[PDB]
Paper text:
Typically, the type IV pili are helical polymers constituted of one protein component, the major pilin. Type IV pili not only serve as multifunctional organelles allowing the adherence to host cells and the auto-aggregation of these bacteria, but also play an essential role in their pathogeneses. Immune evasion against antibodies targeting type IV pili is thus attributed to the structural diversity present among strains, including variations in pilin sequence, sugar type, and phosphoform.
This strain expresses a class I pilin of the SB type, a GATDH sugar on S63 and G3P phosphoform on S69. The final cryo-EM map of pili (left, SB sequence type, GATDH, G3P) at an average 2.9 Å resolution was generated from iterative helical refinements. The density was sufficient to identify the locations and positioning of GATDH (yellow) and glycerol-3-phosphate (G3P, red), as well as for building atomic models of monomers or multimers of PilE. The phosphoglycerol appears clearly on S69 pointing away from the structure. Molecular dynamics simulations suggest that the glycerol portion of the molecule undergoes rotational motion, which is supported by the lower resolution observed in its electron microscopy (EM) density compared to the phosphate atom. Interestingly, the proximity and relative positioning of GATDH to E56 suggests the presence of a hydrogen O − H···:O bond. Accordingly, molecular dynamics shows that the allowed C8-C9-C10 bond rotations in GATDH allows O5 at the tip of the sugar to rotate, which in some cases permits PilE to alternate between one and two simultaneous hydrogen bonds between E56 and the sugar. Analysis of the dynamics of hydrogen bonds formed between GATDH and E56 side chains over a 1µs period shows that they are present 42% of the time (SD = 18%, average of 30 pilin monomers). This further confirms that the GATDH is mostly immobilized with limited rotation, and might furthermore apply to most strains as E56 is highly conserved in pilin sequences.
Numbering used by the authors: 1 to 161
Write the structure that this text describes.
Amino acid sequence: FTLIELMIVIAIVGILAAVALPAYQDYTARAQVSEAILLAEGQKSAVTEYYLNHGEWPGDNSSAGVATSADIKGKYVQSVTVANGVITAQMASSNVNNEIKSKKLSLWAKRQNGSVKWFCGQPVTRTTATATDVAAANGKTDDKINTKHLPSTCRDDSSAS
Ligand SMILES: *[C@@H]1O[C@H](C)[C@@H](NC(=O)[C@H](O)CO)[C@H](O)[C@H]1NC(C)=O
Ligand SMILES: *OP(=O)(O)OC[C@H](O)CO
């Protein structure tokens, strides 16, 4: 070989040392959102029992049978709230992933003639405790967990039935 080959080798070493990386932030966000999903999954029993024994969905954490929203917290979750039978979880505003800072995800259920189906996805709202339909959360806010930061199973629309 000669000097040109060595220079090319050094250039290739620099090229390899200055390479790019894929988007691992999405995977870390999914891993951190799994905790919020697990925390929100634990309030299903109380809401279901109240609905079965009273005929209407709970309107607040008080008669649902759970603690204050500010007390249901984890490493990356800061609040879990129940409103008209809908469970919503909010992530922390610091020491967490940048993409899922102060964002919300929701869980809700619909009653069938022989079963009760549960859904998971972007935030939804219910207007009346005796209603059977849901809609989108808001149009004047940006506190929605992106599709890229959710598992493929936890991607449901408000019109799903
Ligand atoms: C428990 O949640 C119920 C939905 C609520 N009931 C009503 O709001 C009435 O049906 C009028 O809509 C109860 O008042 C709640 N009980 C409490 C807060 O102690
Ligand atoms: O009242 P909740 O338990 O839903 O928590 C409220 C929180 O402090 C910010 O909305």
